[PDB]
mmCIF file of C-alpha atoms and ligand atoms in Angstrom:
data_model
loop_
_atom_site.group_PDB
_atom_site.id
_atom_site.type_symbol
_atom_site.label_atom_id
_atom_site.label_comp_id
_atom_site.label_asym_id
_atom_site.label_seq_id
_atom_site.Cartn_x
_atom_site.Cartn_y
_atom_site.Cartn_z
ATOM 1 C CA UNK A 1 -40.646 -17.300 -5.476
ATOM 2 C CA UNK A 2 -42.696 -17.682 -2.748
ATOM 3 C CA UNK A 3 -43.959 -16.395 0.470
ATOM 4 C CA UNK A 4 -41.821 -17.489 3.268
ATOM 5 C CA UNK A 5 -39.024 -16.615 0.270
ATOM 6 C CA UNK A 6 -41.078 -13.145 -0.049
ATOM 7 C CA UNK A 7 -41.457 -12.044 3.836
ATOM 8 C CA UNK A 8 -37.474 -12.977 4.382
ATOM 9 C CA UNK A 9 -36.663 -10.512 1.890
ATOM 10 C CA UNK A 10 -38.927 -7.919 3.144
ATOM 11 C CA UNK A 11 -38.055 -8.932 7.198
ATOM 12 C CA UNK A 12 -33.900 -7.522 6.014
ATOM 13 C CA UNK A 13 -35.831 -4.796 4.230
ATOM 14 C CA UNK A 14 -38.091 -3.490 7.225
ATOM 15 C CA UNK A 15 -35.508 -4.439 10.035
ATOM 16 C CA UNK A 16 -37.689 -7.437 11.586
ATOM 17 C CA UNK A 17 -34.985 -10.064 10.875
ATOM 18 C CA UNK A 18 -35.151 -11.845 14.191
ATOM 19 C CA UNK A 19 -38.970 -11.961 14.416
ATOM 20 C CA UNK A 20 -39.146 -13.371 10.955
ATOM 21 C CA UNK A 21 -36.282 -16.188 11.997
ATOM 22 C CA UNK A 22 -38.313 -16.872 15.069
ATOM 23 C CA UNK A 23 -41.614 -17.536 12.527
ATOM 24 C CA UNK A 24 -39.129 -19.927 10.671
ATOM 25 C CA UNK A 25 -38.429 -21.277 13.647
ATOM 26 C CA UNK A 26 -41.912 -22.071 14.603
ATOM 27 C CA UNK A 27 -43.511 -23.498 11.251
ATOM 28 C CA UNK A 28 -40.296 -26.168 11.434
ATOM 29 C CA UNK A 29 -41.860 -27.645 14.564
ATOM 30 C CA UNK A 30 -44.943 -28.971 12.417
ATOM 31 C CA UNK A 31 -42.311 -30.311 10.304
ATOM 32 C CA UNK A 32 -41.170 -34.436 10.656
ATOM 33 C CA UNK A 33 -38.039 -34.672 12.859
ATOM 34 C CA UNK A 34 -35.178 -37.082 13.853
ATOM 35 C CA UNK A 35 -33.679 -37.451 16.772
ATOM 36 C CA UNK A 36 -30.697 -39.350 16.197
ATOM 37 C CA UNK A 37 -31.742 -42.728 17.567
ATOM 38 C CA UNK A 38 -35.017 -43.563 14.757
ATOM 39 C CA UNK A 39 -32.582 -44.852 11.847
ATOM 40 C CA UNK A 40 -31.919 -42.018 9.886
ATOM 41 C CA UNK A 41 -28.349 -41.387 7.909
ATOM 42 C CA UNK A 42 -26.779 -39.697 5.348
ATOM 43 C CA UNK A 43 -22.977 -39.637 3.592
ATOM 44 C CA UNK A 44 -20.512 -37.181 3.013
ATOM 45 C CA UNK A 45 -19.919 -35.365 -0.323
ATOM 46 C CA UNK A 46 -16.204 -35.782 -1.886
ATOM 47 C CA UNK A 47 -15.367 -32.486 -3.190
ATOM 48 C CA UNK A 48 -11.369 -33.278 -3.835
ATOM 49 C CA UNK A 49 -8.418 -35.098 -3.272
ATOM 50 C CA UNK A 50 -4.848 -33.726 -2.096
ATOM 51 C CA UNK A 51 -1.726 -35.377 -0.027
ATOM 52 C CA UNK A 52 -0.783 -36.493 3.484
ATOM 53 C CA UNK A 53 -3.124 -38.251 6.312
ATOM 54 C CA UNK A 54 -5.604 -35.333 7.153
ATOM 55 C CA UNK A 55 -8.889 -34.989 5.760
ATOM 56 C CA UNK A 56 -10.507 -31.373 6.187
ATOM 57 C CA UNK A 57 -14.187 -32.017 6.329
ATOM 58 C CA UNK A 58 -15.999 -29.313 6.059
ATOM 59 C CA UNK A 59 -19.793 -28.433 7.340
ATOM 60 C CA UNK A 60 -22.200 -27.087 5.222
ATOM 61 C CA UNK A 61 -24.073 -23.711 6.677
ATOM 62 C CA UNK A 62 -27.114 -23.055 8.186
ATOM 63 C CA UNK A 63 -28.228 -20.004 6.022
ATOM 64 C CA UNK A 64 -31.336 -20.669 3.902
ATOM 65 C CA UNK A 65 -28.301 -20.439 0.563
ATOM 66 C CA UNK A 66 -25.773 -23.052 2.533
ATOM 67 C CA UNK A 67 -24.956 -26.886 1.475
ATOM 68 C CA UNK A 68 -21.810 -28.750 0.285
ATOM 69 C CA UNK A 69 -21.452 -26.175 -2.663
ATOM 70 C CA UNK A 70 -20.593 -23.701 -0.675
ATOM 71 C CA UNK A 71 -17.078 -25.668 -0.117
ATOM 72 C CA UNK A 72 -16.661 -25.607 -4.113
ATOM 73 C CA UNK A 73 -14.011 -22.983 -4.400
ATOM 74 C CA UNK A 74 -12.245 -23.946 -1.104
ATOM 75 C CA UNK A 75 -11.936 -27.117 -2.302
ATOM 76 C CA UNK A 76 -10.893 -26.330 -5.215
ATOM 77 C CA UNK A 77 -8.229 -24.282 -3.821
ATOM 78 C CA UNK A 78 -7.247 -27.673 -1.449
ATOM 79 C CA UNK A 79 -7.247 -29.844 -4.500
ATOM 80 C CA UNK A 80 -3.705 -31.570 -4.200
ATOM 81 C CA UNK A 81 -2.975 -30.486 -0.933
ATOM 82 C CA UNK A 82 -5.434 -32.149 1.268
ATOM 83 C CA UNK A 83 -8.326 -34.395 1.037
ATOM 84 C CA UNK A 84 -11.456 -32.347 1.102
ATOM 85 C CA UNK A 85 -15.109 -33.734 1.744
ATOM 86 C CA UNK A 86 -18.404 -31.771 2.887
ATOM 87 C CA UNK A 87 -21.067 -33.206 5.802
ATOM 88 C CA UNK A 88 -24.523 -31.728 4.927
ATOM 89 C CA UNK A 89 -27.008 -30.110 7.180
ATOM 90 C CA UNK A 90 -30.211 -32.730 7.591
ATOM 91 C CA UNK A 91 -33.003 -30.890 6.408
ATOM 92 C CA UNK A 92 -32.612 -28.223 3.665
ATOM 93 C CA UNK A 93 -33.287 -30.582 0.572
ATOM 94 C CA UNK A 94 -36.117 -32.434 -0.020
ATOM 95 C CA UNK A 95 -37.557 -35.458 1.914
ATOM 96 C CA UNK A 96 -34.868 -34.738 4.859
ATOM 97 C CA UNK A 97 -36.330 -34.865 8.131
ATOM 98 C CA UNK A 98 -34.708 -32.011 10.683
ATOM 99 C CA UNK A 99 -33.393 -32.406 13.767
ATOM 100 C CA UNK A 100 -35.202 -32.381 17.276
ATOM 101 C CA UNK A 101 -31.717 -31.586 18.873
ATOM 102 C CA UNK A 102 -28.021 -30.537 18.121
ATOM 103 C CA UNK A 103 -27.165 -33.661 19.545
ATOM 104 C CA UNK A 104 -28.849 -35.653 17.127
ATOM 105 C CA UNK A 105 -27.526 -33.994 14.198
ATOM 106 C CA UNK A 106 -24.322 -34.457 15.667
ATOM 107 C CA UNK A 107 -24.816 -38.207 15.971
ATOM 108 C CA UNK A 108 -25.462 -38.856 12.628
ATOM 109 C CA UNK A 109 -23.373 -36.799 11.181
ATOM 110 C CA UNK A 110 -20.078 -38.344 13.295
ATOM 111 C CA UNK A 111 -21.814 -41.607 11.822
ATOM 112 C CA UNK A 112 -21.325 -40.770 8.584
ATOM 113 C CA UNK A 113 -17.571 -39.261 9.361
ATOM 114 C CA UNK A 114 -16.481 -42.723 11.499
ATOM 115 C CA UNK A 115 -18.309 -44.664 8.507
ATOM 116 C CA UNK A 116 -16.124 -42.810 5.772
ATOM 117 C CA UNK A 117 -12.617 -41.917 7.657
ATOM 118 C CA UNK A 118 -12.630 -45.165 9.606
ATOM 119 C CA UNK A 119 -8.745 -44.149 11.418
ATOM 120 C CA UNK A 120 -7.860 -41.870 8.336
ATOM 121 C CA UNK A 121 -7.205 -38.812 10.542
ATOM 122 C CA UNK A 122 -9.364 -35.632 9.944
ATOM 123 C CA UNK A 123 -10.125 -32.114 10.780
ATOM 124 C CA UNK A 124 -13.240 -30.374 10.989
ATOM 125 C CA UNK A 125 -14.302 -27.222 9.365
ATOM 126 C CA UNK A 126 -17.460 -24.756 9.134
ATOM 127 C CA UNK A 127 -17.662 -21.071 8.144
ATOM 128 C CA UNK A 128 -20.284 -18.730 10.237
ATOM 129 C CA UNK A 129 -23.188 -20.835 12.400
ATOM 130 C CA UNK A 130 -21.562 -24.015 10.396
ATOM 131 C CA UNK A 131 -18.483 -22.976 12.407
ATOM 132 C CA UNK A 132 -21.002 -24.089 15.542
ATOM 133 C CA UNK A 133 -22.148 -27.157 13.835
ATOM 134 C CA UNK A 134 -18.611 -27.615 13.009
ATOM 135 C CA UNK A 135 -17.247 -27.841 16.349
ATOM 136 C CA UNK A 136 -20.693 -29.539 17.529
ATOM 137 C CA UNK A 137 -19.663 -32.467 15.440
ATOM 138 C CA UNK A 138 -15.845 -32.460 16.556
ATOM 139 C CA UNK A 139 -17.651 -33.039 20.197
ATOM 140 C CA UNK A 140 -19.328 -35.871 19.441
ATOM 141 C CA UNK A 141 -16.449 -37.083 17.427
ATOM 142 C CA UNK A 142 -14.029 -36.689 20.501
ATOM 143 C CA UNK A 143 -16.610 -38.244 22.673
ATOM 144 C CA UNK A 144 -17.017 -41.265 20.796
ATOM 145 C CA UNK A 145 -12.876 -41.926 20.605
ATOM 146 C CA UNK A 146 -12.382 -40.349 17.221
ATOM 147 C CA UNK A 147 -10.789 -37.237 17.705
ATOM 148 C CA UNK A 148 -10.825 -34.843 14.707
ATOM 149 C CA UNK A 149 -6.815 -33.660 14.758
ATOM 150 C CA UNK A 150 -7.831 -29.772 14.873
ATOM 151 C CA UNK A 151 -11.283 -27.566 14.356
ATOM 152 C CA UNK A 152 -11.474 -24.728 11.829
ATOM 153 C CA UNK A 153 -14.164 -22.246 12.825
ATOM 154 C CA UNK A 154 -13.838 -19.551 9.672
ATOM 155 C CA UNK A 155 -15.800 -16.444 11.038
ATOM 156 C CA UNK A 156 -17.506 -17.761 14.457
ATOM 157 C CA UNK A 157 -19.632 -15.707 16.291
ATOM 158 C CA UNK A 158 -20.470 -18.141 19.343
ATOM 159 C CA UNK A 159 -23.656 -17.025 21.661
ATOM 160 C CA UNK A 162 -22.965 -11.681 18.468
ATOM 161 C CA UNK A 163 -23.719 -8.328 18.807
ATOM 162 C CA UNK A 164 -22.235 -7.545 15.219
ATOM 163 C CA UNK A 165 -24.237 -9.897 13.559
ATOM 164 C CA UNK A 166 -27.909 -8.746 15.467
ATOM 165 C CA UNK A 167 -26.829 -5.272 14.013
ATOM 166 C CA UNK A 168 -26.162 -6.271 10.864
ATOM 167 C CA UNK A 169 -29.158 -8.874 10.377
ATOM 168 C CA UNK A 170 -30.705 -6.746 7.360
ATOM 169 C CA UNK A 171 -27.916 -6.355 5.692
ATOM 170 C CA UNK A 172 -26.717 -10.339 6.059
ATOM 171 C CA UNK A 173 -30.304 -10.883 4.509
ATOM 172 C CA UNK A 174 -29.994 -8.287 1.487
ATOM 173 C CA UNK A 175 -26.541 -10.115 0.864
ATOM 174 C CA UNK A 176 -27.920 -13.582 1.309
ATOM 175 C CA UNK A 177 -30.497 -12.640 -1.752
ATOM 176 C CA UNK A 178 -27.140 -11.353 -4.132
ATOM 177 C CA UNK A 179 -25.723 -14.894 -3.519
ATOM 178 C CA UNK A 180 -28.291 -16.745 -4.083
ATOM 179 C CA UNK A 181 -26.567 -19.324 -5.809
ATOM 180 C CA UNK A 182 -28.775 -22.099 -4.634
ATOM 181 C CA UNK A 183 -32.643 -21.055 -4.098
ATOM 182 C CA UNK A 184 -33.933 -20.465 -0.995
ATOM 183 C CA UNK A 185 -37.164 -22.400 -1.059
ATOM 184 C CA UNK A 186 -39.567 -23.172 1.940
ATOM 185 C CA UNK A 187 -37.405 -26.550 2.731
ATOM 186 C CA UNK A 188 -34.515 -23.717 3.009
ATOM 187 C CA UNK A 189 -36.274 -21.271 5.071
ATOM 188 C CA UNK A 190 -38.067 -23.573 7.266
ATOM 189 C CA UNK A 191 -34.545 -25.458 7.795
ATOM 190 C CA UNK A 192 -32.919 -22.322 8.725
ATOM 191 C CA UNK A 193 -35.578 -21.283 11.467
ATOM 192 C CA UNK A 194 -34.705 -24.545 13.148
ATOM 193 C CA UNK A 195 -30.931 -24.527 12.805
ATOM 194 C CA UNK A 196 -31.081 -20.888 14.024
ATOM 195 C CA UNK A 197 -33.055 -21.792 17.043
ATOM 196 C CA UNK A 198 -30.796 -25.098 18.086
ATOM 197 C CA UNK A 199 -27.642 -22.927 17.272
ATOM 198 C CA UNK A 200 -29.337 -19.904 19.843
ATOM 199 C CA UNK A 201 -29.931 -22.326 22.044
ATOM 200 C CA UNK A 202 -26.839 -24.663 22.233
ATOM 201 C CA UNK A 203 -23.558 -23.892 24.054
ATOM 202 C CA UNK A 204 -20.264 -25.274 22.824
ATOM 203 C CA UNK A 205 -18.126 -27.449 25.296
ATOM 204 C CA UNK A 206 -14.569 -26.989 26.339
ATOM 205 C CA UNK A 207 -12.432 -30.088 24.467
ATOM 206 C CA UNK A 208 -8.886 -29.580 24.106
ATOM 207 C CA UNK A 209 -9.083 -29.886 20.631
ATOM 208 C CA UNK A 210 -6.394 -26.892 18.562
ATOM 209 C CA UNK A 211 -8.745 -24.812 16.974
ATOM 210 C CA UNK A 212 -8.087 -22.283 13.947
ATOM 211 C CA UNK A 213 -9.866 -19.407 14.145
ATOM 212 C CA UNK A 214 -10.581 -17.795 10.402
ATOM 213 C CA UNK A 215 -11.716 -14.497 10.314
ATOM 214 C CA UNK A 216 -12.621 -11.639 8.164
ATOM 215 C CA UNK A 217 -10.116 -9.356 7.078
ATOM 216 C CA UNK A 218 -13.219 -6.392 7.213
ATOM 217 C CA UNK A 219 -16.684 -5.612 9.009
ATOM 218 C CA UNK A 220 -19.903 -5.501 6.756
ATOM 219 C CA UNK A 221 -20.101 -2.249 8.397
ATOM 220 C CA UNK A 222 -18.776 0.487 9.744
ATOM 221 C CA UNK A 223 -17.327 -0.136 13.687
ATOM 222 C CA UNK A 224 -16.263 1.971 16.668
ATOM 223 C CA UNK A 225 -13.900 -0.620 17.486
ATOM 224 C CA UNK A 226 -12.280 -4.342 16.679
ATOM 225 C CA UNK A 227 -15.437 -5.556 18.528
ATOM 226 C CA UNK A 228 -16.972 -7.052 15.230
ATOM 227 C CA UNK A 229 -14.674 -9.402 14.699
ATOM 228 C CA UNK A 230 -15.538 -13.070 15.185
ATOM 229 C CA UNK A 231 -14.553 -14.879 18.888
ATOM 230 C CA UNK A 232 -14.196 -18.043 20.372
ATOM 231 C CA UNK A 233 -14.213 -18.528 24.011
ATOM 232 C CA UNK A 234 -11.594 -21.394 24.215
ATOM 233 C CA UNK A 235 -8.588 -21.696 23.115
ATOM 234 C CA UNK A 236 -7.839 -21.180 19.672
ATOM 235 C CA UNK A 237 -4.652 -20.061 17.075
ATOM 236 C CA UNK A 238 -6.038 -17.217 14.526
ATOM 237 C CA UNK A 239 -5.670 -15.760 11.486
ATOM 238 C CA UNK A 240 -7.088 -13.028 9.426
ATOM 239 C CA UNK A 241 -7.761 -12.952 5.615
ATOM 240 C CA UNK A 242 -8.851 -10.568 3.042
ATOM 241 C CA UNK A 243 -12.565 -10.258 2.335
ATOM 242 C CA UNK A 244 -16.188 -10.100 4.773
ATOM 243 C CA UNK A 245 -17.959 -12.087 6.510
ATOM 244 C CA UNK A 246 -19.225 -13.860 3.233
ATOM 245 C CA UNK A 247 -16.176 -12.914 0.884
ATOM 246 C CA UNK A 248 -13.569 -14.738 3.066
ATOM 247 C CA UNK A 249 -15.183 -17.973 1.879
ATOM 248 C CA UNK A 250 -15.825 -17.608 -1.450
ATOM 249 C CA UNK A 251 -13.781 -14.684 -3.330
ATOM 250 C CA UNK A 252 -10.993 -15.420 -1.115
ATOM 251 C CA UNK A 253 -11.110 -19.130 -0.204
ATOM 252 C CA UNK A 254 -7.609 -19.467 -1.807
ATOM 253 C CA UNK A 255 -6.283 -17.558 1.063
ATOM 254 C CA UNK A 256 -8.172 -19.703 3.495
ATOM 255 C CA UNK A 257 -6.599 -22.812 1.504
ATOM 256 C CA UNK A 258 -3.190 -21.610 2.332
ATOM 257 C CA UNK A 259 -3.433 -21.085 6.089
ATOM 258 C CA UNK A 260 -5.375 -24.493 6.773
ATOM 259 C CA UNK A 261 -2.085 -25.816 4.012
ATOM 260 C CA UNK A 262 0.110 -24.211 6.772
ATOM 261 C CA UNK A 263 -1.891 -25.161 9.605
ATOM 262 C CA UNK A 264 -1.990 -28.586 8.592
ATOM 263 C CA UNK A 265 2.133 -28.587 8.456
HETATM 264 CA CA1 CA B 1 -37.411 -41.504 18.620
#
């Protein structure tokens, strides 16, 4: 382990989530940055092939546990009926330099996309804050002439009141799927995303949008206020599972509606 792995643990535990994400937040400054114009690229993963002319890219998270691999089973849900390929988050693995600014993630990132679609259309995906990068990078797609054909934002809470109250509980869960190990690259990486994603406000584009939610709070709720939003206009559908089992137990029912979607 180690101590910025430690204290996270122990922030859920003690109910001081948010000041601990701020500390994240802070050490990532004294980290080396890009900001989008100072050379720096990277590629998208292929995680599977399938039919037709639409390529559902999917963004990796911004939890301390998220990459490509947590696209595995959704992919391998979409294998042979749509392309699938994953666009990392700058930052969380080794010698990767963060971000000074959503909008220069964004511009490499719809690099990378333009470099590896070319006019094969697309649409974007993301699951939880990587619903935000998600529709981030759909912006600067559309901006640059290269509309993605739709945006999939699977459980989107755009700036959350369900979320702040369950912060502790996120973090104890975050720990029981720790698939991939949140080391001080992680943490660090997740203080910054967190802060640009606070900060940042999505734009109005035009662009359908497929809202994915959870078929089930994390907790128990007075009302259907819990439930992810969007504030523009968007289709939606709801499928079995939480916040984090939507994704991962359940992916094969998020296959089918983006298979539907798609049609
Ligand atoms: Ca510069």
């Amino acid at each position: 382990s180690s101590a910025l792995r430690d204290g996270y643990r122990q922030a859920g535990v003690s109910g001081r989530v948010r000041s601990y994400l701020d500390l994240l937040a802070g050490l990532s400054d004294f980290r080396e940055h890009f900001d989008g114009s100072d050379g720096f690229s990277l590629d998208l993963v292929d995680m599977a092939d399938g039919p037709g002319e639409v390529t559902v890219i999917c963004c990796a998270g911004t939890a301390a546990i998220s990459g490509p691999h947590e696209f595995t089973r959704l992919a391998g849900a979409l294998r042979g009926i749509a392309p699938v390929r994953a666009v990392p988050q700058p930052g969380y693995e080794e010698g990767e330099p963060l971000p000074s600014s959503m909008a220069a993630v964004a511009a490499v990132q719809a690099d990378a996309v333009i470099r590896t679609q070319g006019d094969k259309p697309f649409v974007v995906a993301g699951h939880s804050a990587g619903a935000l990068m998600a529709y981030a990078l759909a912006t600067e797609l559309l901006d640059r002439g290269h509309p993605p054909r739709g945006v999939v934002l699977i459980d989107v809470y755009p700036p959350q009141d369900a979320m702040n109250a369950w912060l502790e509980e996120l973090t104890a869960t975050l720990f029981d799927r720790e698939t991939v190990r949140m080391d001080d690259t992680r943490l660090t990486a997740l203080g910054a995303y967190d802060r640009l994603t606070g900060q940042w406000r999505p734009r109005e584009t035009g662009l359908p949008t497929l809202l994915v939610s959870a078929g089930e709070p994390m907790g128990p709720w007075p009302d259907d206020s819990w439930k992810p939003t969007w504030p523009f206009e968007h289709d939606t559908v709801a499928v079995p599972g939480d916040h984090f089992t939507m994704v991962q137990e359940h992916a094969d029912a998020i296959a089918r509606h983006i298979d539907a979607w798609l049609g």
